[PDB]
Structures are given as C-alpha cells and as structure tokens.
Design a protein around this ligand. Structure first.
Ligand SMILES: CCCCc1ccc(S(=O)(=O)Nc2ccc(NC(=O)CCNC(=O)c3ccc(NS(=O)(=O)c4ccc(CCCC)cc4)c(C(=O)O)c3)cc2C(=O)O)cc1
Ligand SMILES: Nc1ncnc2c1ncn2[C@@H]1O[C@H](COP(=O)(O)OP(=O)(O)NP(=O)(O)O)[C@@H](O)[C@H]1O
Ligand SMILES: Nc1ncnc2c1ncn2[C@@H]1O[C@H](COP(=O)(O)OP(=O)(O)NP(=O)(O)O)[C@@H](O)[C@H]1O
Lengths: 564, 564
C-alpha cells in the first residue's frame, strides 16, 4: 500500500516526528481554551466581578503565545520531515533511473521520463509538505476540542454520532472520483511535456519544415484537455466542502433544538452554552479546511503510485567478479538477438577473436552492425546465446567492471553541455591527469581546433555539442575513447562525418599506438578496412564470409560487390 | 510591472470577475452575522425570551447555506479565471518559444528551456489559482468584518490604527527576503532539470563510461542546494505569521484594557462585547491565513518575472512577401558569418548558382560547410552580406514562405517519436496524400525495410527514432525531403551512414527525377561529387577553387589531395 511504504521512509525521523506532535498539541490545547475563555469572561462580566475581569488582558497574550511558539516549531517541522523525505525520494529515484536498461529509454521519450521526477515527484512535495501539516492540524485540533466538548456535556454531544456515516460517504464517494481523475491529469501532463521536449529536440526539423503550426495544435489540444480535467476536478472538490458543512449545520440545528427545550433550560448558565457554540464553530472551520485539502492529499497519492511503479520497474542485474580481461578475447557462440518488437538481426553468428587483433565488420545496412556491439557492453541482453569474454561467461562480470573497461564510440555521438575538458575526460577517468587529455586530443587530431576556440579546453559547449562542428563533435567521442586506456576500442562508425585527411591521421595514430588491442571497427569504407587483420562479411546477422583483405578480394563473393 | 501586465490577461473575464466578488461578498456578510448572532442569542437567553429563542435554530442552517452557495460559486470561479489565464499563457508561450532563433536553443539546453514552461509556468498556476481565492477571501471577509467592527464602536476600533505600520514593516521586510530567495530556488530547479535531461540524452554515454556515480554527485548537490533553499524560505514564512498575531494580540490586549475600565463599564451589555471578541478572533484567523498564503503569492511573482522575460526575449523577424522562387538562383555576394562567440568561418564567399545546377561543396572539416547552409533557411542571420534568392533580397521573403519551400537534410538527423508515415510526412505536407509517401519512400530506397517492420508505416518509433537502424534513420529524412516537392534539396551530408548500395540507388533516383533543381550536396566522398555540375573547393570559408569534376582533377590543387 502507498501509505504503508511511505511510513518506512520516515523511520529515522521518529525522534522529530513527536516534537511536531507536541507543538501542535499545545496549539490543540490553545483553541480549546477559547471556549473556556468566552465562558470565563461572560461569567466575570455578568457577575460584575473585578478580580477576574481586569485580569483578562494577560490571558490572550499568554494564550496567543501558545498559538505562536509551538505552532512555529510544529508548523516548521512538517516542512522539514516532508521535504527531507522527498529529497531522499528523488535522489534515490535517480539511481534506479540511471541503472534502468536501455530498452526502457527507447520505449519512453525524454518528456515522459523527465516529467516523472520533475512533475510527478514535484506534486508529491506540495501534496505532502502542505497536506501533512493541514491534515495533522485539522485532526489533532478537532480531536482535542471534540474531546473537551464531550467532557462538558456528553449527553448532547453523543447525538453527533448520527450523521457521521453521511459525512464519511460524502467524503469517501467524493475521494475515489478525484483519485481516478488525479491519475488522468498527471498522464495528460506527460503528453504536454513530451510535445515541448520533442519540439526542443527537433527545432532544426520544426523550423525547416514550417511545422510550428502543427506542433501548436497538439500542444493546444493537450493543454485544453489538461485544463478541462483540472476544472472537472475542481467541481467535485469545491462541491464537497460546502455540503459537509450543510449536514453538520443540520446536526447543530437539531442538537440546539433538543437542548433548548424549556424543561432542559431551567438553569442554562448562558456562558456555558455560548462556549458550546464557539467550540462547534471551531470544529466546523478545521473540518472545512480538512475537506478543502482533500484535493492536495489526493494529488500526492496518484503521484506516489507512479513513483513507486518506477521504483519497482525491472532494473538491470549483476553477477559479481573482477578481472582485467587480459586483453579480452571475445568468442561469440550461437548468439541470437530476438528483439522485443519481433525483428531478428543476429539470427546466426560465431567468432573466435584473439587478443591483439583488428577484426572489422563490413556489410550491407540494416544487417545488425550496431546491434551485436550492444550485447558486448551489455546494453542489450542476449537471447539463446552467450559471449565468452576471456574464456568465461560475460554475465559473470559486473556491469561496472565491464563497461568501465570497454571504450565505445556510438554512431550518434552525444556531447554534454559542459566544458571541453570534462567531455573528453567524462566518466570514471574524470581525475586522470591534466596532461593525459592533451595526449588523447593529439592522438585523435582534436589538438588543433580546440585552441582556436574562444576559451579552449574550458569552453562550454552547446545544448548537445552542436557548436563545435559537424565533424569536431565526433572527434570528442574518439578523444575520450582513446583517453580511456581499456584494452578494447569498438570504433562503431567512429569515422563517419570526418574529412579524408582527419581520418587518415587517426588511423595512423591507432596503428602506431603500439598497444595492440581487440579493437572492432564498423565503417562503411575501405580505407579503414584495408588494414584490418580480419574482415567479416555480415548480412542479415549471418556471417557471409571471413578472411583477410587479400583473401576476400581473391574470393570476391559479397566483398567484391562492395569494392566499386 | 508584473501586476499591471497580469491584469491585461484577464480583460475578457471582467464579466465573470464580478460574480466571484458577489460570492465572496455574500460570504463576507455571513462572517459579519456571526458576531451579531452571538449577541442576539445571548440577549434572548439572558432575558429568558422564547419567541427569539426557539427561532434561533433556523438561523444556523440558513446562515450556513450562505457559507455554501456563494462560497462554491465564487470559490469555483477563482480556479476558472486563474486556470484559463494560465492556459492562455503557456499556450502563448509555446508560440514564441517555437519562433525563437536557433541561437537561443544553442545557449540553453533542453532542461533549462523545458523547466521554463513545465515548472516556471506550473508554479504560477498553484501560486495564482489557490492564491487568488485566498487573497480575495482574506480581503473581502476581513474588510467587511472590520467595517462592521467600526460601525458598532468606532471610538475603540480607532486604536487599531497604530500597530498597522508594525505589521506592514514585518510583512514588507519579510516579503523581499522571500522574493529574492524565490528566484534562487527556481534557478536551482533548472539545474536539477538540466542534469536529468542530459542524463536521459546521454544514457548511452553514461552507461558506456560508468558515469552514473559522477552524475549522482551533481544531481545530489543540486537537490541538496534546492532543499536548503526551500528550508530557508520556510523559516522566513512560518516565523512571520505567528509574529503578526503577537503584535495584533498586544493591540487587542491594550484595547481591552482601555475598554474594561470601571467608568466605561457602567452599562456594558456583555452580549455586545462578546460579539467584539468574536469579530476580533474572526479577523485574526483570516490575517493569519493571508500571512500563510504570502509564501505561495511570492512564489508566483518570481515565476512571473522569468516568464515575462521569456515573452519579451528577442524572437525572429519577418518582412512580408510571397513568390515561387522560379527555381531560385542563389547568388552569394560578400557574405560573412562573424559568430557571437567570435569564430569566423565565412570570411569570404561568392557564387552565381544557376537554376537546374547541381553545385556541391567539398573541403576539409571545420571550414564552414554546415554554416553557410543555415543562411538559405535563415537559421543564422547574415552579417556584412546578403543572399540574392531569385535576384531579390533574401530578407524580403517571409520565413514561412522560405523554409516551407527549401528541403533540408541536417547532418544530425532528428526523428520524432511518432508513426513512420507521420515522420516521413511531417510538417506543412502532413496532408499530402496516402500514396505520395510511398513514392517518396521508393525514391529514397526506404520502401524495403519499412514493410518489414512489425507494423509498417504506422509503427511508433523510439525516443528519437533510434530503433530503425544506423542508416535507416537517415533515410527517413531523405524520404521527407524528397516528398517535399520544393525546387531546392540541400543534401547536407545526407549520405553519411548509408551503405555503398543504398547511396547508389538514391543518387540514381536523384539523377532520374527529371525535375532539375538547385540541389546543394555537402558530402565527404567522390561518388556524389563526380557527377556534380560544379564543385567548389572551400577551406576556412574562402573558396579555394571552382570548376567541374574534370577541370578540378586536371588543375589538381587541393582537389587532387582529396582523391587518395
Ligand atoms: C483584532 C484582533 C485580532 C487578534 C486577536 C484577537 C483575539 C484573540 S483571543 O485571544 O480572543 N482568541 C480568540 C478570540 C475569538 C475566537 N473566536 C470566537 O470566539 C468565535 C468562534 N466561532 C464561533 O463562535 C462560531 C460559531 C458558529 C458559526 N457558524 S454556525 O453557527 O453556522 C455553525 C456552528 C457549528 C457548526 C458545526 C457543528 C458541529 C457539531 C456548523 C455551523 C461560526 C461561523 O459562522 O464561523 C462561528 C477565537 C480565538 C482563538 O483563540 O482562536 C487573540 C488575538
Ligand atoms: N554555434 C557556433 N559557435 C561557435 N563556432 C561555431 C558554431 N557553429 C559553427 N562554428 C564553427 O564554424 C566552423 C564551421 O563548422 P560547421 O558549421 O560544423 O561546418 P563544417 O565544420 O565545415 N562541417 P563539419 O566538418 O562536418 O564539422 C567551425 O570552425 C565551427 O567550430
Ligand atoms: N530497438 C530495436 N527495435 C527493433 N528493431 C531494432 C532495434 N534495434 C535494431 N533493430 C533492427 O535490427 C537491425 C539492425 O539494425 P542496427 O542495430 O542499426 O545495425 P545496422 O543496421 O547493421 N547498422 P546501420 O546499417 O548503420 O543501420 C535492423 O533491421 C533494425 O531495424
């Protein structure tokens, strides 16, 4: 249950959880004394007393002081507990979100995912910090003053326990509706976030094709739906608070009718009954506030359900092992890549890559080039197969120990909005050295244009590194990959947008490194493949042919086709 | 001023803006009657009256009905007005955000921009919808009760107008502190959003380099800073509401001391003084509520300032013109691209492109390849130069009329998370035809794998179209570009990730189109450049050489270097 799990998050706050009770507890004892205060002043003034009459002024300053000190400490602690608990929620949510599999990222766009911690969790803050204080107040205060009301006269008060089911039904019935609608408005917000996020991502596409008008219609429709849902939610919530007062007002009228009969009014002591009316009003107000905060309470519950679903989602796994890979020799054996959608791209595959080799994959597009690499780094779980990395199961090695020792250059190079040095030295090697980055840049051929930048290595990039160049942005990935001195360098189309001269120097640097690795090259070119130790012709996953550059040319086959 | 401009947004709501006042006005009158109700009941009971005693119960259900009907109608209208106003804000904010220049997108990442409408505007909703009602109540009700208080006894009430400067200073002084801090917390949230958005974008990079631990520290630091700022803001708020009660409580103590002197107590008629105390308490409660909601009120103002800064930001411009471009002939003349950062890449450039030509740009990377293209589409304003599109100024043509008739293929292909058919037919041509998409796919060579997809042309893509393939994702851009039948096709590195076979068919289709255009090709290859009508060798912006494929080879120069 949502409520049960929330309590588990405030376990270390029990010591502070009772201080807030005391602070409002004194406040609960402050608003009950007013009923006694009115009776006391009426008795003193009615009897023309002077000793207890001139003493009244000191009783409101002292009384109000309790409405202050005690209200602040109790009122301020509510924010502390709720804000601290949410801080441990969003912070802990980030860990699982980062540890989630790449498949989850594919299914949900940035707008949907970001709204789940930026808005979903955000509403939980205002729905908990403000709601917890309001509910505990409109609780303990009402409880205390109603207990006092029972003590002064139990006979009349017991009549109040007749309409209680009516208020319960009017609130329970009026709460399930908002709970159902609360999840709907949150879902609509995700669509709103998705449209803006996609528009930001595709600004280049949006402006080029004059799609701004089309984007507005979808965003306008989503905003209209959200507004209608909010207005509908307001109708039910705002309709409940006045109604619950009407039934309580009828109860007050009935109890007054019962009490004010002449046979019961023989000796009333009006000062006593006016205290009763004041207590009744001081119950009516807090219950009205409790009914008003119903929307705030319900909003948090809907957010909590989605948050905990995200927490329970099936994140990645681990095995436990630590090895240096001794120049890991990757040996695929009957590996398949049956995707969730249904497409099959690694139907059949097998290799015996040896340490120090330069195996490269060449073939037609849409065959599984950048799909087999993912399972090597564990970005995609294997199906009906396994990989023997260093003559041992790949799964047995930890993800941290595996990804940290495998340099990668993705087809779509991603650059963070930070300084150039941080991007080149991003990751576990953020504290490598102040000169290692220079060596990596020189090897990658990026040590010529960085100095030409306005600031140099400490220049902040753009939104996604668009401001460097069409080709320079790619060199940053190569630079960081070479900086990461792992004995693996999967150059997955690393030299795609680079110029003829720039790529030639990078190939020369790779050849001259004199630190032979098991680098895998996936390039749609012959210059990089001409020097490959072994060339594997792959089409639709199946290995069409294998051999060296000379062997394939003599055999012709499919390689001869890709030689025009 | 923020307040002045906000009123301008509710101009058409003046008809409903007065109905809410009546609802609160009736509610305000109800709050007045309670003080009269206590006096009436005490006078009736004190005199042992029966005609006005048994009639009292009918004055509670009727009185509460006014606390209902009137509170609901006016209470629900507050949400309607505020929610409708914000709906016209976020909806109108979207238009300017989409019309903003590409430079603004570069400066601010997605997280900063998205948080300015998803959180900045979102806080304005709760800071206005639930704040406007609270201020209207803590106003009308208090004003009416105070007017009644003055009427019954003006002599005593006048003493209240001494502490008023004290409460004003305690509130005015405490308001600027939160206003300054309100902007700080909002700024911190933008950093929180930035980390999450960048992590979502770079999940491939984050996982590959084991950077999850590094990301957590930055996110953890931002969350801690936000929590500390919020806690500091909470201290200011909760420390104000009890204090204003203390000074007001002292005022009431002094006034009661002045009033209760024996000389003034000759004929007190206790029933009237208890009404005085009830009015005093029912004034204390709403002012406390006003102080409490001061926090939400201040939160909205900080958001409003940033929102209006975004609204006032310098969006793009327009001129006003319409033409078919008659196969627009591009004639660059003394064009420069002095960037905002400072780098220069179009130092010198001039051309006389003619209709039906196939001019292509070839040169070294980092020279200005994908920077001059932005001019023709107005993604970047020209400096100390101009472009004559159809022997007329480019600026004179409307942006919509210009972008809508210029097919573009950006180096970084962006695919939206939608169906394939919508993505291929995205933009002004969303209603082209049910068969034209097939022709475009066949021309681009994309009508071979789409049918092999799980659903086909109506299959939802991933977050950014990552699930097609490394090369297929590029073909979608080519498909939409060819579908858009403008007399321009700037193939800016269109064939980069495509294989040798796919690119050949696309080139053949372009040649066979038999619809000669002014297509511009920016490719680091020779297959597309061999058949180019004119080849321009560009280095560092300056035109190194011009001529046909045969001419450049004979002249050697830099072209001979780019031939190995
Ligand atoms: C200008 C100076 C400000 C500063 C200051 C000024 C003063 C101080 S102080 O030291 O004196 N402190 C207080 C003084 C007065 C007060 N207040 C009073 O006595 C009235 C209390 N409410 C009422 O009697 C009342 C009664 C019935 C009402 N409506 S009903 O009959 O329909 C109805 C009745 C029952 C139900 C539910 C039935 C469930 C069985 C439903 C409907 C209403 C209404 O309509 O709201 C109101 C409080 C304090 C304090 O301690 O909180 C301290 C500081
Ligand atoms: N927003 C920008 N801020 C600063 N410099 C920029 C910006 N955009 C481009 N440049 C520079 O302008 C020059 C041209 O780069 P670009 O627009 O990518 O064309 P290009 O480099 O010739 N194509 P490519 O070789 O694939 O990068 C380079 O020196 C870039 O660093
Ligand atoms: N997440 C996915 N969902 C569905 N199909 C996928 C997914 N990832 C890859 N595929 C398919 O698997 C095949 C392999 O594609 P991909 O992983 O891009 O390697 P590739 O096509 O050989 N490299 P490239 O030629 O540059 O695209 C293609 O048919 C893709 O459509």
């Amino acid at each position: 249950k949502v409520y049960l799990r929330l309590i588990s998050y405030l376990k270390p706050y029990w010591g502070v959880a009772l201080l807030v009770l005391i602070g409002f507890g004194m406040n609960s004892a402050t608003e009950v004394s007013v009923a006694k205060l009115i009776k006391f002043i009426i008795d003193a003034i009615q009897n023309a007393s002077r000793a207890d009459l001139d003493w009244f002024p000191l009783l409101i300053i002292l009384l109000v002081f309790f409405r202050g000190l005690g209200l602040f400490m109790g009122g301020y602690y509510t924010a502390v507990i709720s804000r601290s608990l949410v801080f441990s929620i969003r912070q802990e949510v980030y860990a699982k979100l980062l540890r989630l599999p790449a498949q989850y990222y594919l299914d949900n766009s940035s707008g949907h995912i970001t709204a789940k911690i930026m808005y979903n969790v955000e509403q939980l803050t205002a729905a908990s910090s403000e709601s917890l204080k309001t509910i505990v107040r409109d609780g303990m205060i009402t409880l205390g003053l109603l207990g006092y009301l029972f003590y002064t006269n139990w006979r009349l008060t017991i009549c109040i326990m007749v309409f209680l089911p009516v208020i319960g039904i009017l609130v329970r019935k009026a709460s399930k509706r908002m709970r159902k609608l609360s999840m709907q408005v949150q879902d609509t917000m995700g669509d709103v976030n998705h449209v803006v996020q996609e528009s930001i991502n595709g600004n280049a596409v949006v402006k080029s094709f004059a799609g701004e008008e089309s984007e507005q219609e979808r965003f306008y429709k989503s905003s209209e739906e959200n507004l209608k849902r909010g207005l509908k939610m307001v109708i039910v919530q705002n309709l409940n608070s006045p109604v619950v007062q009407v039934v309580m007002a009828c109860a007050m009228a009935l109890i007054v009718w019962l009490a004010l009969r002449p046979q019961i009014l023989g000796n009333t002591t009006a000062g006593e009954f006016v205290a009763y009316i004041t207590a009744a009003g001081l119950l009516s107000k807090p219950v009205k506030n409790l009914t008003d905060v119903n929307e705030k309470l319900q909003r948090g519950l809907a957010a909590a359900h989605s948050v905990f679903e995200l927490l329970d989602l099936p994140e990645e796994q681990n095995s436990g092992e630590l090895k240096p890979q001794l120049q890991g020799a990757i040996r695929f054996d009957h590996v398949v890549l049956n995707y969730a959608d249904g497409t099959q791209a690694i139907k059949d595959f097998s290799l015996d890559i040896r340490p120090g080799e330069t195996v490269a994959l060449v073939g037609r597009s849409g065959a599984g080039k950048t799909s087999l690499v993912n399972m090597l780094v564990r970005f995609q779980e294997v199906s009906s197969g396994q990989i023997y990395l260093d003559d041992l199961p790949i799964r047995d090695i930890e993800l941290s120990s595996l990804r940290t020792q495998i340099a990668m250059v993705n087809q779509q190079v991603v650059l963070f909005n930070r300084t150039v040095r941080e991007n080149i030295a991003y990751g576990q090697l953020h504290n490598a050295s102040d000169e290692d980055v220079i060596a990596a840049a020189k090897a990658a051929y990026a040590h010529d244009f960085i100095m030409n930048l306005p600031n140099g290595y400490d220049t902040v990039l753009g939104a996604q590194g668009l401001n460097l160049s069409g080709g320079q942005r790619q060199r940053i990935a190569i630079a960081r990959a070479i900086l990461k001195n792992a004995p693996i360098l999967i150059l997955d189309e690393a030299t795609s947008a680079l110029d003829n001269e720039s790529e030639h120097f990078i190939q020369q640097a790779f050849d001259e490194a004199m630190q032979d690795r098991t680098t895998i090259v996936i390039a749609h070119r012959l210059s990089t493949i001409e020097n490959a130790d072994r060339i594997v012709v792959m089409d639709r996953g199946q290995i069409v042919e294998q051999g060296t550059h000379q062997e394939l040319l003599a055999k012709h086959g499919a390689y001869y086709q890709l030689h025009q």
